[PDB]
Design a protein around this ligand. Structure first.
Ligand SMILES: Nc1ncnc2c1ncn2[C@@H]1O[C@H](COP(=O)(O)OP(=O)(O)O)[C@@H](O)[C@H]1O
Ligand SMILES: CN1CCN(C(=O)c2ccc(F)c(F)c2)CC1
Ligand code: NA
Length: 266
């Protein structure tokens, strides 16, 4: 299904720098149209996100579409395998659906025949002007094997690091996830963020999911027995019990590799 996503910038904890850069990248063509004309600048055709899994790359792509009131079409790399007019149909349907965000996920799987499913993509990209109102986003967990062709000018205009959250970003991820939930005053998300160094945004969300299930199940069971003869809250002890099944999903070894790659790009 193709639709405007309901994810906003507010649902995304941390990454405040990346967010302002992305807003300007899409707001400037429409907010200062007379200045984009005077100096002869073309709006951007795409970006590429990279980083450890579960840290917000898909969320950012959806929030960009919600910003532009645009449709979102998501395509996972492995499923382009049956077959090179596959690459052509997708660009048609995205052009049909304009203004549209076209998101290529798991592009590490294609970086490894398949040699020019890539080449069919580069040709669709050059053949599609910015006047078509399609904005391309890719993501990958394997920045080491990115073909630099997809980044030459006229294609994806920026490569952007989305890292594991630091301590302040973990507090924000926790708050954004719980923003419309009834949380008890005895829970200290700043202490929770301290105890979860190395956790991804997805790892943090699961803790929030379990703690909520625990309070709802407890609500069920207690009314069932008071049946024998006031909105309930998610309490500190629900979070205490959710933490038992909590451990990092990204290894210290992969983090080093990601940090080397990004630090050498200074
Ligand atoms: N920065 C973040 N803020 C809030 N939630 C997050 C963040 N990053 C990840 N999550 C949680 O983890 C899930 C997976 O995030 P996703 O963006 O799909 O990861 P990937 O970087 O692999 O695209 C999200 O749906 C959300 O629940
Ligand atoms: C899929 N697993 C095993 C393979 N893998 C890497 O080799 C890797 C990790 C981080 C990097 F920054 C990088 F360039 C490469 C990713 C994790
Ligand atoms: Na990922």
């Amino acid at each position: 299904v193709v639709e405007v996503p309901q994810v906003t910038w507010e649902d995304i904890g941390g990454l405040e720098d990346v967010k302002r850069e992305l807003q300007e990248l899409v707001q400037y063509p429409v907010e200062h149209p007379d200045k984009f004309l005077k100096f002869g600048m073309t709006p951007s055709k795409g970006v590429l996100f990279y980083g450890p899994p579960g840290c917000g790359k898909t969320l950012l792509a959806k929030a960009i579409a919600n910003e532009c009131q645009a449709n979102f079409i998501s395509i996972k790399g492995p499923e382009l395998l049956t077959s090179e007019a596959n690459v052509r149909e997708i660009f048609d349907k995205a052009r049909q659906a304009a203004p549209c965000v076209l998101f290529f996920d798991e592009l590490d799987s294609i970086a490894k025949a398949a040699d020019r499913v890539i080449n069919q993509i580069l040709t669709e990209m050059d053949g599609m002007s910015t006047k078509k109102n399609v904005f391309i986003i890719g993501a990958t967990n394997r920045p080491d094997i990115i073909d630099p062709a997809i980044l030459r000018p006229g294609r994806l205009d920026q490569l952007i690091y989305i890292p594991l959250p630091d301590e302040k970003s973990r507090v924000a991820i926790l708050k954004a996830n719980l923003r419309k939930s009834p949380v008890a005053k005895d829970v200290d998300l700043e202490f929770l963020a301290k105890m979860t160094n190395g956790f991804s945004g997805a790892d943090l969300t699961e803790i929030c999911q379990r703690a909520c299930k625990l309070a709802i199940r407890e609500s069920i069971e207690s009314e069932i027995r008071r049946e024998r003869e006031p909105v309930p809250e998610i309490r500190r002890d629900h979070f205490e019990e959710a933490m038992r099944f909590a451990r990092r999903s990204v290894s210290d070894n992969d983090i080093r590799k990601y940090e080397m790659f990004a630090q050498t790009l200074q």
